[PDB]
Amino acid sequence: IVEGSDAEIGMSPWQVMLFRKSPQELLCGASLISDRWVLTAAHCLLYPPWDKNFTENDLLVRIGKHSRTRYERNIEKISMLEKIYIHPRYNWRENLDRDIALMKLKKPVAFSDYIHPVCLPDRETAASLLQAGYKGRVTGWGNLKETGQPSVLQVVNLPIVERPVCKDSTRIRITDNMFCAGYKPDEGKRGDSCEGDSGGPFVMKSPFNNRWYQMGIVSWGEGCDRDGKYGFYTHVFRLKKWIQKVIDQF
């Protein structure tokens, strides 16, 4: 996260770290949506241009964390993966269209002060809140600058951007399964996702029921925190029919 700040303890209790078994390293962010399901970006698991193709046994998820590198004894919980599900129309060839994946845990995780699931949006919450100028929140342990790494989880609040401005900022083809967020050059404030924040959550707090909803997944950007560029996030509600199909049947 660029130009964010240290998270408070328990601020993002749905935050998940995707961790490689060997070598032991951070791979991505992710989010907890039930006691056995974790949501992430498909490009965290499958991205052939970089020879990335992770299988279940390659990976662990670490839940309840704050520190990036420490083993947080008596606080974090480490879970093995039963199965990975990638969206069948994930477009890794062109523009990361439908950049979404689910991971089922081998055993359900116990909730705690530090471990708790986020809500997924209903149609009405999405229609109400996914509006230009309205702010959401991104969390992660990724890089602090485009060209280092944080000691603890980072947080940044960012406004959703009008779709014509998103489109006019890039030569990459945008789709309805994406939205973009960040400040404009003239707006003063800064901030963005970056490498390593991939797969983490873009959340909003509903003013109607005071619950946190995951509206987006950290997906793609050209650089990090560049003027006139914006971060792009998977549109969770647009892909919720697939989410529900996987969970109902698996």
């Binding site: 708790h116 699931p117 809500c119």
Partner: peptide
């Protein structure tokens, strides 16, 4: 889950984190 999105150390105790008000102020 039925209590999704309600954080043990914030909403469940009626405590506010240091920047959530920035989000609310944007919901106009």
């Amino acid at each position: 889950e039925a209590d999704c999105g309600l954080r043990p150390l914030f909403e469940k105790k009626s405590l506010e984190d240091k920047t959530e008000r920035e989000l609310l102020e944007s919901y106009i």
